[PDB]
């Protein structure tokens, strides 16, 4: 039930421990320790900025309007959520995360403009 | 299509590149470099805090309930969005941004209290 305890569990089980890991992301001699702390903050903020760009700010589970390409993975839901742990899944689609991230950004950019014109 | 590429374009064109600039805001000898990095983070967080205060957290385009005073600028939409680049616009209303920011804060404070009493 602690940090990374679910690392060996199935994706559908591990997805219930997202707050366990989220809370462990934040907290001349002594300078390299400041560099490590500053860097940890910068890393954290980049992931948070990215979620904001995709329209997922403030949440751990975020649904989008980006469809899945089976060229990315053609496994079904029982193969992915009831087997392939998150470590296994990450390896399998590592080659596609930049394509997916680009498509999440493009979608949010269309959504924010369509919503401003409906408030007009 | 890169960072600040749209700086010379019209406001209505440049507004479509907001993620290009947002992503370039984050990333004894060596101390002044830590000071620069810490300062960059602090600057970033103040702008993000301010958007949160105004009720614009998590978005690049945010509509508000604050009306425009033509004492701030009496130009129409074709003058502003189809000419005056953002650099030109920023110069023209620089004298009024603190008045506008104060009015955005006051509005959000009334909105959050009206919404808590409707959930009661």
């Amino acid at each position: 039930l602690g940090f990374l305890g679910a690392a060996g569990s199935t994706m559908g089980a591990a997805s219930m421990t997202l707050t366990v890991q989220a809370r462990n992301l934040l907290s001349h001699w002594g300078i390299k320790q400041l560099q490590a702390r500053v860097l940890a903050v910068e890393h954290y903020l980049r992931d948070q900025q990215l979620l904001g760009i995709w329209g997922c700010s403030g949440k751990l589970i975020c649904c989008t309007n980006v469809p899945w390409n089976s060229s990315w993975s053609n496994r079904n839901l029982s193969e992915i959520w009831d087997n392939m742990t998150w470590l296994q899944w990450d390896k399998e689609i590592s080659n596609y995360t930049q394509i997916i991230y680009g498509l999440l950004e493009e979608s949010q950019n269309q959504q924010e403009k369509n919503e401003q014109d409906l408030l007009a | 299509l890169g960072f600040l590429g749209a700086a010379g374009s019209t406001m209505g064109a440049a507004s479509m590149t907001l993620t290009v600039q947002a992503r370039n805001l984050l990333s004894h000898w060596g101390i002044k470099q830590l000071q620069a990095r810490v300062l960059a983070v602090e600057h970033y967080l103040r702008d993000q805090q301010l958007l949160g205060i105004w009720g614009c957290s998590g978005k690049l385009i945010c509509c508000t309930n604050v009306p425009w005073n033509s004492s701030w600028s009496n130009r129409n939409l074709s003058e502003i969005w189809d000419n005056m680049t953002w650099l030109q616009w920023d110069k023209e209303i620089s004298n009024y941004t603190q008045i506008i920011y104060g009015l955005l804060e006051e509005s959000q404070n009334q909105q959050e209290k009206n919404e808590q009493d409707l959930l009661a």
Partner: antibody
């Protein structure tokens, strides 16, 4: 000079389908919202559908809401309407018109600036 | 949806008024009333928009106005060539975007 030319269909059986299309020239197509306005042979004008200049937002009159699709192609300057289930009550002249909406950073419309001549759609 | 009279008429040189009465969540809520001129056999032409404005390309003999839930089109120096079906329309919200009246068959005597 702005021209909107309907190049759609004619006679269709009840319960069938018919697609209309309209070619635009003389203006920047992509700068304007467009709509379809219908006129039954013995009646006045009725608004049927509206589409955004970027093609993302569509609106319909309730009477065709689950039956008609309005679309747009900004590369080919083409407006189109796909009609399904075609009731006898859908017989009318269908006009291609420019207007009905703006994009927030533009002055508003809420009126129709340009009209085509209209395709006659007959359901028998 | 909107009510406007049939058969408005008058002789050349006389003015005529074509009325358009709607409802509160219509003409009474938004100042977006437009008028169109349709000669039989032709597509409608825009004459008036935003209650009082006219597009470039039309004469100043055509002037719009409104009060309460009623809008109207005034034609001043009436000409024989003004015979047409005049229609009013209005923006009526984001649920029922546009509504129209029936046509007014303006006849010049």
């Amino acid at each position: 000079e702005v021209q909107l030319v309907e190049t759609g269909g004619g006679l269709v059986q009840p319960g069938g389908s018919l697609k209309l299309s309209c070619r635009a020239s003389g203006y920047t197509f992509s700068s304007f919202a467009m709509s379809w306005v219908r006129q039954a042979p013995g009646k006045g004008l009725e608004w049927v559908s509206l589409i955004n200049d970027r093609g993302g937002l569509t609106f319909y009159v309730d009477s065709v809401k689950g039956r008609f699709t309005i679309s747009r192609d900004n590369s080919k300057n083409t407006l189109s309407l796909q009609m399904h289930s075609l009731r006898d009550g859908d017989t009318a002249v269908y006009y291609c018109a420019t207007g009905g909406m703006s994009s927030a950073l533009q002055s508003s419309k809420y009126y129709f600036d340009f009209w085509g001549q209209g395709a006659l759609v007959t359901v028998s | 949806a909107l009510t406007q009279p049939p058969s408005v008429s008058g002789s050349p040189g006389q003015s005529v008024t074509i009325s358009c009465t709607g409802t509160s969540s219509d003409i009474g809520s938004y100042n977006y009333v437009s008028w169109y001129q349709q000669h039989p056999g032709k597509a409608p032409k825009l004459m008036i928009y935003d209650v009082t404005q006219r597009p470039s390309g039309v004469s100043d003999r055509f002037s719009g106005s409104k009060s309460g839930n009623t809008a109207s089109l005034t034609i001043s120096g009436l000409q024989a060539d003004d015979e047409a079906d005049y229609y009013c329309s209005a923006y009526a919200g984001r649920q029922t975007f546009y509504i129209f009246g029936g046509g007014t068959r303006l006849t010049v005597l």
